[PDB]
């Protein structure tokens, strides 16, 4: 399937353990899609000083169009000193590493992959 409907845990910054996917765009871009796959992503949302507080390069989900069954459609793109590998609409969060963090809530999407 083009698209894959996951349900993604959001986590609070200050808990997040392991703080981003890798060393250069083509890995995090990788690491990402493989724990989407997995089910072991999570969400950060974008707020006020919660960049600085995660790794480069990062990997944001972006709002692909204007919601099947609840479900956002959304697509990656990557991030690094300021170049974006990718174009796409709205930020929704920026993806990390889910290792049994406690979610604040879900965001139900459905995932260009």
Same mark, same amino acid.
């Given at each position: 399937?083009?698209?894959?409907?996951?349900?993604?845990?959001?986590?609070?910054?200050?808990?997040?353990?392991?703080?981003?996917?890798?060393?250069?765009?083509?890995? $995090?871009?990788? !690491?990402?899609?493989?724990? *989407?796959?997995?089910?072991?992503? @999570?969400?950060?949302?974008?707020?006020? +000083? %919660? &960049?600085?507080?995660?790794?480069?390069?990062?990997?944001?989900?972006?709002?692909?169009?204007?919601?099947?069954?609840?479900? $956002?459609?959304? !697509?990656?793109?990557?991030? *690094?000193?300021?170049?974006?590998? @990718?174009?796409?609409?709205?930020?929704? +969060? %920026? &993806?990390?590493?889910?290792?049994?963090?406690?979610?604040?809530?879900?965001?139900?999407?459905?995932?260009?992959?």
């Amino acid at each position: 399937k083009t698209h894959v409907q996951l349900s993604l845990p959001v986590l609070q910054v200050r808990d997040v353990l392991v703080r981003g996917f890798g060393d250069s765009v083509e890995e $995090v871009l990788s !690491e990402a899609r493989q724990h *989407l796959k997995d089910g072991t992503c @999570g969400l950060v949302e974008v707020e006020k +000083g %919660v &960049l600085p507080q995660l790794e480069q390069p990062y990997v944001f989900i972006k709002r692909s169009d204007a919601a099947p069954h609840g479900h $956002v459609m959304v !697509e990656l793109v990557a991030e *690094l000193e300021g170049i974006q590998y @990718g174009r796409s609409g709205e930020t929704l +969060g %920026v &993806l990390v590493p889910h290792v049994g963090e406690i979610p604040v809530a879900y965001r139900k999407v459905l995932l260009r992959k």
